[PDB]
């Protein structure tokens, strides 16, 4: 798995791969790793899929309950706080989870990283999975805050491609999302074999 996310002037961008393995046998190659929690939030899958789906569904339900009760969209900080305080009651059982919560609240964009151990932290560039190490190198050398939209897309795509080239437990297709002040949008879903020729 390789999932990355970063924020800049015109909001946040998320990217992920589409492979799943069971040992050394490729089960499927068309997985959805960018979860659509709500029309204003987004998630991410890494580790166990059942967990990273169940708990995020519960989170979405709680967000909707809050919106109904208080008549105001919830914030990213409180959402990540909820998600962290939910799985902390299952410390030392076998749960594996690594997640990114992204959004835009009254004080601007927001990106938080969460995991099953308990460390919840903000930031501006994040990447997790078995191929995060290869993607950090490409994301750093190329990152900038005063960037355009037509370029961050290519940046994330190239990072994911170069991560799949070396890592064996990651490959398949590349999914990319972009969040804005209004809501998020699905911009593209490419294939690695169709990108290899685009480059050399």
């Amino acid at each position: 798995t390789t999932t990355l996310a970063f924020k800049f002037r015109h909001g946040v961008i998320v990217a992920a791969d589409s492979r799943a393995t069971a040992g050394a046998y490729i089960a499927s190659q068309t997985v959805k790793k960018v979860i659509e929690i709500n029309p204003y939030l987004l998630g991410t899958m890494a580790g166990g899929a059942a967990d990273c789906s169940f708990w995020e569904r519960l989170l979405a339900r709680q967000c909707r309950i809050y919106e109904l009760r208080n008549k105001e969209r919830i914030s990213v900080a409180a959402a990540s706080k909820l998600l962290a305080n939910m799985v902390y009651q299952y410390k030392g059982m076998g749960l594996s989870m690594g997640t990114m919560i992204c959004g835009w609240d009254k004080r601007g964009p927001g990106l938080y990283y969460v995991d099953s151990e308990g460390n919840r932290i903000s930031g501006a560039t994040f990447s997790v999975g078995s191929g995060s190490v290869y993607a950090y190198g490409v994301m750093d050398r190329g990152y900038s805050y005063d960037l355009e939209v037509e370029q961050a897309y290519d940046l994330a795509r190239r990072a994911i491609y170069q991560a799949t080239y070396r890592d064996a437990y990651s490959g398949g297709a590349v999914n990319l999302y972009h969040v804005r002040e209004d809501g998020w949008i699905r911009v593209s879903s490419d294939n690695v074999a169709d990108l290899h020729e685009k480059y050399s």
């Binding site: 962290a84 902390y88 410390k91 990283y113 151990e117 308990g118 460390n119 919840r120 932290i121 930031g123 994040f126 995060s132 190490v133 950090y136």
Partner: protein
């Protein structure tokens, strides 16, 4: 990794820590903050495991702020420290034990400044200076060599810079920038972070 240090003067207190987070090969962050403000003139520096630090610190913070908004005055540091120690030793012998170390630098109007120490087993010593983490090995001696009870302010800052240079010279982990704060009769003050290019 981790590093906390505290120094006590005649009419002030000086605390410092590192600001870094990592997952076994890579540092995710470089602007962390290991400090917590329990009140206007009390500071808790916690460190240790992953998800226990924030839980414990926020529990303590809530209870102290509640005491304040309930009674009408604040809580003395010599009391907050024993409260922390009691709660931690109690939760040590249950299904959810916490694995953390902490300092509780503070200041008071009657007894003056204070500096304490804990070791995740609920000991609660007290000293005119103290430190945590592996780095403590390469910077405690220095204190014992150059420290005096009537140490002024800038001289304490210089001693701190000395210890940090020693760390960056003999220690393997990077730890390039630190957060430092001071406590005085008027309150808390934040100083320019000690950074090395």
């Amino acid at each position: 990794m981790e590093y906390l240090i505290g120094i006590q003067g005649p009419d002030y207190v000086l605390v410092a820590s590192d600001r870094v987070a990592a997952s076994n090969i890579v540092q995710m962050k470089d602007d962390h903050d290991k400090m917590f403000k329990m009140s206007e003139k009390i500071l808790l520096l916690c460190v240790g495991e992953a998800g226990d630090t924030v839980q414990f610190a926020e529990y303590i913070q809530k209870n102290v702020q509640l005491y304040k908004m309930r009674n009408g005055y604040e809580l003395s540091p010599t009391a907050a420290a024993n409260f922390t120690r009691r709660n931690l030793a109690d939760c040590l012998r249950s299904r959810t034990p916490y694995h953390v170390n902490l300092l509780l630098a503070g200041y008071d109007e009657h007894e003056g400044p204070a500096l304490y120490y804990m070791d995740y087993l609920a000991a609660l010593a007290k000293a005119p200076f103290a430190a945590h983490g592996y780095g403590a090995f390469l910077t405690l001696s220095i204190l014992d060599r150059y420290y005096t009870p009537t140490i002024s302010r800038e001289r304490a800052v210089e001693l701190l810079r000395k210890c940090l240079e020693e760390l960056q010279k003999r220690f393997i982990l990077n730890l390039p920038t630190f957060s430092v704060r001071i406590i005085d009769k008027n309150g808390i003050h934040d100083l320019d972070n000690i950074s090395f290019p």
